[PDB]
Amino acid sequence: VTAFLGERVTLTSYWRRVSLGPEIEVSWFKLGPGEEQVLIGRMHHDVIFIEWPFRGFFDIHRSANTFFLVVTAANISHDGNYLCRMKLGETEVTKQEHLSVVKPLTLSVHSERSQFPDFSVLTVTCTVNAFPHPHVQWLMGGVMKEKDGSLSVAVDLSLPKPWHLPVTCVGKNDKEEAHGVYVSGY
């Protein structure tokens, strides 16, 4: 599945036999990089317990033969694979589930004129802050990482006099796309 930043998104797993729900020892894990396994929470006989580091960001509940992992609010840390171990005594099944988190791209533009040696070189800056693959391009720079875990990148474009305006930049985040047009100076 996939879901945006801040949203309440749910992941699922289930036991094939429709006879059984509570009896299964369900236990979700977040796959940290390098084949790692971090315990998020456990549920058995309808008593759930989420680990303290994940407490209040995740939660688990059950209905019938289905098991849910609710992320009460999604953030960039949560992009990654998740593993569910469902055991019934001797027999145990391991179901994976991926989650992509997405930040809706944020395209910004402002101009500047050069202060030296003249005020002819008009420089414009197109910037885009998205996740997971932001990409900016001028039609016809430095990769930064934000506090919230998202990525930003921008590029500049120098236009000596006469300013061949209007000019247009194209920001995109994978399929998502948006533009910025600069019409005239002050």
Binding site: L20, G21, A64
Partner: protein
């Protein structure tokens, strides 16, 4: 009169209802008599019985004119005739001695079949038994 009110053919359909249901881990919520608040089996069946009307309608619903829906109406038919065999008690006791249950339908049906079946057994033995004043016993609950 009442000794032979609950026919065998009524209970025939009840077990048929349960047999026909699919095995599932599902659960549902419903009102029913708290078997521990009201321990006495004479007054338990008495109280439990009046509330059953509202339950069957809110709970046991089937597609119109199917083998099971017929049974349900038959049980409501049977039930109404039986209200005469029970002495009403103080109305203030209404909605007391009752609790929530989050269980499978299969379990719920098992609870209702048991109410009818246990009633047949106490009724066959003593027909007049359900005249006992349970106003004392209903005070004991919430």
């Amino acid at each position: 009169y009442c000794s032979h009110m609950i026919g065998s053919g009524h209970l025939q359909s009840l077990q048929r209802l349960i047999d026909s249901q699919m095995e599932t881990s599902c659960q549902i919520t419903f009102e029913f008599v708290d078997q521990e608040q009201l321990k006495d089996p004479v007054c338990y069946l008495k109280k439990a019985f009046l509330l059953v009307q509202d339950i069957m309608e809110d709970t046991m619903r089937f597609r119109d004119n199917t083998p099971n829906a017929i049974a349900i109406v038959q049980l409501q038919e049977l039930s109404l005739r039986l209200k005469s065999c029970f002495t009403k008690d103080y109305e203030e006791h209404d909605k007391a001695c009752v609790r929530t249950f989050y269980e499978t339908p299969l379990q719920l049906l098992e609870k209702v079949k048991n109410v009818f079946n246990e009633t047949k057994n106490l009724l066959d033995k003593d027909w007049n038994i359900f005249s006992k004043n349970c106003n004392n016993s209903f005070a004991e609950c919430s």
